[PDB]
Amino acid sequence: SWAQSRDEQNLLQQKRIWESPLLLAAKDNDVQALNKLLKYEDCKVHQRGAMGETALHIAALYDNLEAAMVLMEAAPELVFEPMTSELYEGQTALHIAVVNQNMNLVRALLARRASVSARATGTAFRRSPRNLIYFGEHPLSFAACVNSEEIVRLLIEHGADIRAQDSLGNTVLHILILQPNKTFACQMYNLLLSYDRHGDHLQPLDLVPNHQGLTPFKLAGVEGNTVMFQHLMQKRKHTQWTYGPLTSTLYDLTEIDSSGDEQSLLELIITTKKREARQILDQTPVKELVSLKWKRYGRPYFCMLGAIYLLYIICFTMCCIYRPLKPRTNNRTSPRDNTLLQQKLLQEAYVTPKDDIRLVGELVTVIGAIIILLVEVPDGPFHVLIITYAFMVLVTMVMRLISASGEVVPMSFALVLGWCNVMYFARGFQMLGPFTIMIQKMIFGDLMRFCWLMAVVILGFASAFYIIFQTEDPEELGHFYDYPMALFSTFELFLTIIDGPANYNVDLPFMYSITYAAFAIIATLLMLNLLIAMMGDTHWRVAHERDELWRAQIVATTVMLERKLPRCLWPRSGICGREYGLGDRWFLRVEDRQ
């Protein structure tokens, strides 16, 4: 929709050029006709195009130097004209000569005092998936992103503010981080810091945030720019001594580690969707900072919560084992009625000393399910499972108070969710950590992507198996006696967890042997070993990147564990530079051998 609208405008531009003799003589290098056209009376010099363009934009756009000069002595006021469309709003001819790097034509427009502070506020210039370039809004931003060091030196001299911000708030240093050629942005970043030699009317230029509060150093980490991260990090390290093949380097940790309640660089890499951003975790101030947080104050407090959680689930288990049950009051309805016990009423539930021991163990599992809904809910997948466990304990709390039949259904969800959250505390162990990443990527990327092909095969054969045995007696082969049991039996024959139905004392239907032989080939052989082969490649991919997926679990745990525990038992990392003559900062010393 948006692309089809944009394509009809770029074809409409080439029509309006082709119709106008003025614009066609500018597109071509036709200085002959531009003489003869401009000597006519009134000439339609200020005629508009499809993009809002003028004649002097066209000569700048097609790199026609000789046609662009003749239009400037004819009409000198075309230099001050922006494009007036919606898709190129504000773009002047000084932007177009800067992008095309027409070095001779930039000096011409600066001699005609073209404004170097004109903002290209269109929609082909926004940072968006619709646009292939994001060059900013000012001519200094366009020249820096095309790697034109001569034009950047040229129009800073003519007075381009280097501290200018576009709509997103990005300065010229934020935009250089977002460019795809990362090597040339490192040479260009240094050239723009050789300037800013002014009065420094705020904090210096590499410390100015955009509208999301990111300085250029944090934006190089959030976006995943590892080349511009290491280049910007060398302003922060500080070599103490060099003793042969040894170097004691002292890193800064001011924007990397959490100062107060602001979001630090470790909190922003975890809370972003770029897979490239998790390459910053392997960098030389950040790799040593996570190991200090984890080995000292993270792994003690994570194996302490993990052992308080085991004693909570064993206490919840034994008060589901010893739940109150009484013999059945009624008589059996049908011969298919197997239930012979029944749960007690609330009055008769607690009338013995062993019921008072259970009442203590039941108050603990209620209090612990309220504390989960005060730590977690007023704020990944184990967020949802610890909340869902906490509801199921309070759903079966209500059913004990108002005496309601069917407490086994909230308890059975609470047993298998309460026990399978012990898998959360497996990221404290390096050899057990990414096992839960394999269980995640097999469920939400292999099973939830191939169950749609199994539910087709199960519904096809369970309906065939049901009507084959629909005339038969279920007291011999009762696998398919009604339709929900034929679906459950066919799901079990698929996974080969119950044996195939056979009697050998009666004559089975003729279509049974043919249908079950076709079933056991497409279901048990072929489509069950597709899934085992799909999950075998998911295992291989995760176990290959095994140690970098564990370190992203350690960062996310330490960030979680610090913002919820009180500050008095979480010391700040590093050495404080007050009483060593280094400032107010917090340094991390790294000694290395080369």
Ligand X SMILES: CCCCCCCC/C=C\CCCCCCCC(=O)O[C@@H](COC(=O)CCCCCCCCCCCCCCC)COP(=O)([O-])OCC[N+](C)(C)C
CB of 419 to Ca ion, least distance (A): 27
Rounded Cα–Cα distance for residues 463 and 487 (Å):
8
Partner from ligand X, Ca ion, a copy of itself, none binding residue 504, C-beta < 5-8 Å depending on class: a copy of itself
For residue 248, the cross-strand partners are 241, 591
Partner from a copy of itself, Ca ion, ligand Y01, none binding residue 315, C-beta < 5-8 Å depending on class: none
CB of 281 to ligand Y01, least distance (A): 13
On the CB side of 36, CA atoms within 13 Å amount to: 5
Name which of 134, 71, 48 is nearest 99 in CA terms: 134
- Residue 63 or 376: the one with the smaller Cβ distance to ligand Y01 is 376
Residues 363-392 touching ligand Y01, rule: CB under 6 A, are: 364, 367-368, 371-372, 375-376, 380-383, 386
Partner from Ca ion, a copy of itself, ligand Y01, none binding residue 241, C-beta < 5-8 Å depending on class: a copy of itself
DSSP secondary structure of 559-579: HHHHHHS-GGGSPPSSEESTT
3-state secondary structure of 239: strand
CB of 325 to ligand X, least distance (A): 8
DSSP 525: I
Rounded Cα–Cα distance for residues 290 and 558 (Å):
8
How many residues are listed for the chain in this entry? 594
Rounded Cα–Cα distance for residues 162 and 434 (Å):
47
- What character string, x for contact with ligand X (CB under 6 A) and - otherwise, covers 384-423? xx--x-----------------x--x---x--------xx
Examine residue 207 and tell whether it contacts ligand X (CB under 6 A): no
- Residue 8 or 149: the one with the smaller Cβ distance to a copy of itself is 8
3-state secondary structure of 514: helix
Examine residue 499 and tell whether it contacts Ca ion (CB under 5 A): yes
Residue ranges at the known binding site for Ca(2+): 499
Partner from a copy of itself, ligand Y01, ligand X, none binding residue 377, C-beta < 5-8 Å depending on class: none
Token digits of residue 130: 């619709």
In terms of DSSP H, where are the helices of 264-298?
Answer: 265-270, 287-292
Name which of 141, 214, 228 is nearest 177 in CA terms: 228
Report whether 549 contacts 431 (CB < 8 A): no
Report whether 58 contacts 26 (CB < 8 A): yes
Choose which of 31, 305, 520, 590 interacts with ligand Y01 (CB under 6 A).
305
3-state secondary structure of 241: strand
Choose which of 11, 132, 202, 321 interacts with ligand X (CB under 6 A).
321
Name which of 170, 168, 253, 186 is nearest 225 in CA terms: 186
- Residue 244 or 380: the one with the smaller Cβ distance to ligand X is 380
- Residue 234 or 405: the one with the smaller Cβ distance to a copy of itself is 405
Residues 210-229 touching ligand X, rule: CB under 6 A, are: none
Examine residue 584 and tell whether it contacts Ca ion (CB under 5 A): no
Binding site for ligand X (CB under 6 A): 299-300, 303-304, 306-308, 310-312, 314-315, 317-319, 321-322, 339, 354, 357-358, 360-361, 364, 381, 384-385, 388, 406, 409, 413, 422-423, 425-426, 428-432, 440-441, 443-445, 448, 451-453, 455-456, 459, 482-484, 487, 507, 509-510, 514, 517-518, 521-522, 538
